[PDB]
Amino acid sequence: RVTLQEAPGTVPPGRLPRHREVILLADLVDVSKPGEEVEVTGIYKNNYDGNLNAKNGFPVFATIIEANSIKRREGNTANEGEEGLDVFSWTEEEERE
Amino acid sequence: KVRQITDQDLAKIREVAAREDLYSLLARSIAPSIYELEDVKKGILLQLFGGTNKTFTKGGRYRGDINILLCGDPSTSKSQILQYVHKITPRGVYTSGKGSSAVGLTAYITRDVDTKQLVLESGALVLSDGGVCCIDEFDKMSDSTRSVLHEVMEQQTISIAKAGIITTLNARSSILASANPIGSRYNPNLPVTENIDLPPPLLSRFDLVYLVLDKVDEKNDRELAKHLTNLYLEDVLPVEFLTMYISYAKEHIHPIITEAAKTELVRAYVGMRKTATTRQLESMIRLAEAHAKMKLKNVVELEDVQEAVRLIRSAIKD
Amino acid sequence: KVDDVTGEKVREAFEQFLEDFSVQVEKVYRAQIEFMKIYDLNTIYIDYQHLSMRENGALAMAISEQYYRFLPFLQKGLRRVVRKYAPELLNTSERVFQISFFNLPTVHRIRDIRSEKIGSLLSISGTVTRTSEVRPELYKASFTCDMCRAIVDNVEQSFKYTEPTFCPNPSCENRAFWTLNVTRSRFLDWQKVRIQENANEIPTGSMPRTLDVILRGDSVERAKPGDRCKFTGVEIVVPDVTQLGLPGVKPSSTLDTRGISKTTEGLNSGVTGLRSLGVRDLTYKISFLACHVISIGERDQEVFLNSLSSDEINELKEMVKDEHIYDKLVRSIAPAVFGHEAVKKGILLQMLGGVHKSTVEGIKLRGDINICVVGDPSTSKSQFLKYVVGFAPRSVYTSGKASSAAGLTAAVVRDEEGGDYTIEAGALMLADNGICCIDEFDKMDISDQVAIHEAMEQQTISIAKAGIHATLNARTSILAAANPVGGRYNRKLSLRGNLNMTAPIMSRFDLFFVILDDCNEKIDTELASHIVDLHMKRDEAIEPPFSAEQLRRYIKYARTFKPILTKEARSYLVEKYKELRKDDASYRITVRQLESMIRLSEAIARANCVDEITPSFIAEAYDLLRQSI
DNA sequence: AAAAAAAAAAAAAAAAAAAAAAAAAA
DNA sequence: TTTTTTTTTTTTTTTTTTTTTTTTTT
Numbered sequence A: 001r002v003t004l005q006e007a008p009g010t011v012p013p014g015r016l017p018r019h020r021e022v023i024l025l026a027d028l029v030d031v032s033k034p035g036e037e038v039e040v041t042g043i044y045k046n047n048y049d050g051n052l053n054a055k056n057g058f059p060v061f062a063t064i065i066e067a068n069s070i071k072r073r074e075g076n077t078a079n080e081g082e083e084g085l086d087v088f089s090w091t092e093e094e095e096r097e
Numbered sequence B: 001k002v003r004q005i006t007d008q009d010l011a012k013i014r015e016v017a018a019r020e021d022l023y024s025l026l027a028r029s030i031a032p033s034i035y036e037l038e039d040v041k042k043g044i045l046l047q048l049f050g051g052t053n054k055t056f057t058k059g060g061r062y063r064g065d066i067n068i069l070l071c072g073d074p075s076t077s078k079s080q081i082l083q084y085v086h087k088i089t090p091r092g093v094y095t096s097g098k099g100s101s102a103v104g105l106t107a108y109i110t111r112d113v114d115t116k117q118l119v120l121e122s123g124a125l126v127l128s129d130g131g132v133c134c135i136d137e138f139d140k141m142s143d144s145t146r147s148v149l150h151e152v153m154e155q156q157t158i159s160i161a162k163a164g165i166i167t168t169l170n171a172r173s174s175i176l177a178s179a180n181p182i183g184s185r186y187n188p189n190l191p192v193t194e195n196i197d198l199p200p201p202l203l204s205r206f207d208l209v210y211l212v213l214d215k216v217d218e219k220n221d222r223e224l225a226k227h228l229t230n231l232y233l234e235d236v237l238p239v240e241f242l243t244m245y246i247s248y249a250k251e252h253i254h255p256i257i258t259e260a261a262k263t264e265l266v267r268a269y270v271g272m273r274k275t276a277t278t279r280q281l282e283s284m285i286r287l288a289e290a291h292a293k294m295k296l297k298n299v300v301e302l303e304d305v306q307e308a309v310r311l312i313r314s315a316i317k318d
Numbered sequence C: 001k002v003d004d005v006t007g008e009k010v011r012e013a014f015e016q017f018l019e020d021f022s023v024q025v026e027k028v029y030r031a032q033i034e035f036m037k038i039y040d041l042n043t044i045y046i047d048y049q050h051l052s053m054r055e056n057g058a059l060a061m062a063i064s065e066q067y068y069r070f071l072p073f074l075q076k077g078l079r080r081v082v083r084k085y086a087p088e089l090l091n092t093s094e095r096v097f098q099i100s101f102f103n104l105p106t107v108h109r110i111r112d113i114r115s116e117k118i119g120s121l122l123s124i125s126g127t128v129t130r131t132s133e134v135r136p137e138l139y140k141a142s143f144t145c146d147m148c149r150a151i152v153d154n155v156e157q158s159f160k161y162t163e164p165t166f167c168p169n170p171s172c173e174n175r176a177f178w179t180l181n182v183t184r185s186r187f188l189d190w191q192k193v194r195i196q197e198n199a200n201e202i203p204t205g206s207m208p209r210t211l212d213v214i215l216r217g218d219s220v221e222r223a224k225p226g227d228r229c230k231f232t233g234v235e236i237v238v239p240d241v242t243q244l245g246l247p248g249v250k251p252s253s254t255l256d257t258r259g260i261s262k263t264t265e266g267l268n269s270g271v272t273g274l275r276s277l278g279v280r281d282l283t284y285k286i287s288f289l290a291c292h293v294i295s296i297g298e299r300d301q302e303v304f305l306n307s308l309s310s311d312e313i314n315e316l317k318e319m320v321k322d323e324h325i326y327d328k329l330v331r332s333i334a335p336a337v338f339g340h341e342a343v344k345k346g347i348l349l350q351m352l353g354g355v356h357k358s359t360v361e362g363i364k365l366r367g368d369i370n371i372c373v374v375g376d377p378s379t380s381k382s383q384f385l386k387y388v389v390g391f392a393p394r395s396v397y398t399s400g401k402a403s404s405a406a407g408l409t410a411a412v413v414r415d416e417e418g419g420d421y422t423i424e425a426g427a428l429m430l431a432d433n434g435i436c437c438i439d440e441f442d443k444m445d446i447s448d449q450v451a452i453h454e455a456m457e458q459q460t461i462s463i464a465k466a467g468i469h470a471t472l473n474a475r476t477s478i479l480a481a482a483n484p485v486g487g488r489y490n491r492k493l494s495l496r497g498n499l500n501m502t503a504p505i506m507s508r509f510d511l512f513f514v515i516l517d518d519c520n521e522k523i524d525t526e527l528a529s530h531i532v533d534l535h536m537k538r539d540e541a542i543e544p545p546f547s548a549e550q551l552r553r554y555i556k557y558a559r560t561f562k563p564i565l566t567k568e569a570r571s572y573l574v575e576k577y578k579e580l581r582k583d584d585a586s587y588r589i590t591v592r593q594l595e596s597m598i599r600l601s602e603a604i605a606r607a608n609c610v611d612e613i614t615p616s617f618i619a620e621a622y623d624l625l626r627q628s629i
Numbered sequence D: 001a002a003a004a005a006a007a008a009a010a011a012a013a014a015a016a017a018a019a020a021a022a023a024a025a026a
Numbered sequence E: 001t002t003t004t005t006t007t008t009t010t011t012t013t014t015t016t017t018t019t020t021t022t023t024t025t026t
């Protein structure tokens, strides 16, 4: 399990950031590291929490994201173009070239 | 435990305002204990009314508050003068500038004590909105908090951006301050800048600056000691008329300017320019319009501008 | 089943009000329903004054006094009206509708909140100090019996998770053990905001009072912290659900981390007796539920031409036509000052701006103009800054020395309510895509002068400390005001000797403007006369060719253009750069000067509303550069 | 009437270690 | 001037134990 805060660049200047929880299953563990900036494709879900209903006072639900795809964007400004999860990886014809 | 003025109050206010010399009477009333120093009392009486305030769409808001700085030899009676003007004014705060937080005069986002929550607490400049704020020990105020006053005396607003809160408040107050020099005397030979230990812009932006001097004079020393001992010896001053008159003049009255003020003001400024910055003329206008609010009127004339220029040139004399 | 009679009268009266008002015969509310049908909206707006004239307030006062009990009938009547006049708004791709009231006659403060208005329709005002996330609230629940597998739907919930009691089939006997069908259930947006009293309503000595306002539906995120907002809605009361028997063991009978007040231990009157409570005591507190919120404190040409009206469109195109327009614009800037036309021209060029370009290799070319204005005191240098901050959008004002920890770039501060390191905003950061007006630029701290070495050119701030590492964004133009060293300008020393800035920082300023006053008998008379023509007539003293709004519209229209360079313009540019480099002799002139000349040429071209650049523009930019060196 | 299960009851806080600022001086 | 000096600021609770006394449930 990991926690994603909003990136400082995306956050409007002077406002508090928001955070969410992400569940990483097998084959996706230890890919992301604490401190990096990441892009996650996943499914947005809801669940019932007793404490959340007790504190707020209304039947509100908790949300969490089950991660499907992970792409690293730490230091990358070429995200404007390019296709794929890793732009530093090659195919067979590219190695032959 | 421990407003809504009646018509009779209006009538008595009118008949008192019909006095031949209203200037000197409330000159002596504000500080009964203070002997001599009539000129600083004149300036404070003019400050307590303030020139008219205006904010037109194109040019924007123009200030109508008078700022006064008292400084000089260390054992005069400036602190008692400030504590006198504290009570007369309706809404004001008397806090020294010796220490406290760097934003202690403005908003400071603080954690609530009773509940683990967030509270926005305003400072002393915001809490003196629409009145006169008295600062004591101006020379001990820290280099980092000084800049705060700079935005207060320039734009009359304070902005806070902390803990996810970005907002602006309103200061719109008047600054009366008292300071002390370095050493036991203010030697006239050296100029003002070295003694007072204050940045040139901060001293410059004050509308009136008064120097209080103490020289060993037999007549003055005897006269001072005489009335001091007479006060200690056990044997024309209104009590609350000033507060009601101040409120009436501040809440209902708005003077205007006529060409009679034009003719005197332009030539007076030019004659002063025969090192008077453009700040000087906007200082004369404020003082003249504040004098016009006194001796209750609805328009300025020659007497008000003459008194204003006399005051601002007697200030230059020191 | 027992039914109500007054509720039926209110329901039919609301239907009549919706169907019949028509006062502008326009059918304003039917026009609104048609607009919702075409735009697919989910909320209606009803004005109180409009309702304040039908039935002489008999319906309005009935709705106001008992809004809580009359809302179900109002929605029921709205459903019939929608069905009769627009069936398409009866189903989604049913839309849970909302009714928004506004324009109430009187407003209340937070300290007028008493328990005798609970359930009534009110309007309040306050300053927002905290907002939360947009959480989903359970509106219409759906369950399935564990044994029968029968489906129950539309189980209303008030303040806690409520499951059904009797199975749909009386043959089944089941009191519990249901399974929520989270997919079939309907949800809604939910937000909690904290507000406090205004600065004027606070007494001389007071600890500010607070309140909890609930925003729901389409009203989320419309209130931002630090702003002053007027809310309107219904005053409700919220019980403590923890002692109402919440299903899970997670509540654990009021687990606490802090100590409750001993003063109100037994003093807070709690009611007992109810079977659900048991031997417990139920407690209440007052909160507010809001239905309407108000606040009381694109370079694409085709889309731009759509918004403006026909009269505005014709006026703008007639404005563009005249060839004297440029000479007029420099006169419209800051009409409340005397002289300094060059400063006005520079400010206008700064506001128009230059084009931003990106190379295939990924390096960004700057398109922001920085101006520095210097001179001896009392030269009206601080009036220009106020005019810009009042007239330019997304602009901020600041001084050299700053009291804040994040003085001008950024600071790293721990979370007040979280377990992470956050980043505060300096004046440079709070001005992204805007102008930052710096005053008293001389007395800056060296750790800030070195910090601005990145913001002026790369337009970024990059920090790396123990807590956080980030590359922030500061794409801001800078207008700076500075005083000469020593107090007064010397008319034989250069800009360098009189100023204190270093060559790195000095070379990053596009324009330098030295403004000097002179003490002669005649000009002083004109200046005094001009400054004193004000204070008698606040509006007729100054007369510019264009008002503030016309200039503000023209700037936005002109910024849509993006000029290009012609064939002869490039040759003239390289020739002028070579001549300037020759005249310098490399100490003050670099490539940055050529880039700044390109930027100034593009801005001057944007001024004339021309998409092509003529060598006359480069000549003007060259003259402007030469005038400041 | 007699079993099996399920929570309340917490409370507490000084004393030390590490890191970033905002004032002092050879 | 770049060195040393200096205040100071959150850092804290997620855990416990077997009785003793309550409600359900054959």
Ligand SMILES: Nc1ncnc2c1ncn2[C@@H]1O[C@H](COP(=O)(O)OP(=O)(O)O)[C@@H](O)[C@H]1O
Residues within 6 Å of the ligand: B033, B034, B035, B074, B075, B076, B077, B078, B079, B080
């Ligand atoms: N002109 C004066 N009239 C009356 N009392 C005076 C005068 N000058 C000095 N004093 C006496 O000297 C003292 C001045 O103290 P104060 O001015 O409050 O201290 P500070 O110098 O810190 O402002 C007062 O107690 C006052 O009685």
Ligand SMILES: Nc1ncnc2c1ncn2[C@@H]1O[C@H](COP(=O)(O)OP(=O)(O)O)[C@@H](O)[C@H]1O
Residues within 6 Å of the ligand: B278, B279, B282, C336, C337, C338, C339, C376, C377, C378, C379, C380, C381, C382, C383, C481, C527, C530, C531
């Ligand atoms: N047209 C003008 N020409 C010269 N001075 C003016 C003009 N209009 C106003 N002023 C004066 O200039 C002042 C603006 O402050 P300014 O001199 O810019 O402060 P600083 O020089 O410290 O930045 C105002 O107080 C006003 O009195």
Ligand SMILES: [Zn+2]
Residues within 6 Å of the ligand: C145, C146, C147, C148, C149, C150, C167, C168, C169, C172, C173, C174
């Ligand atoms: Zn069943």
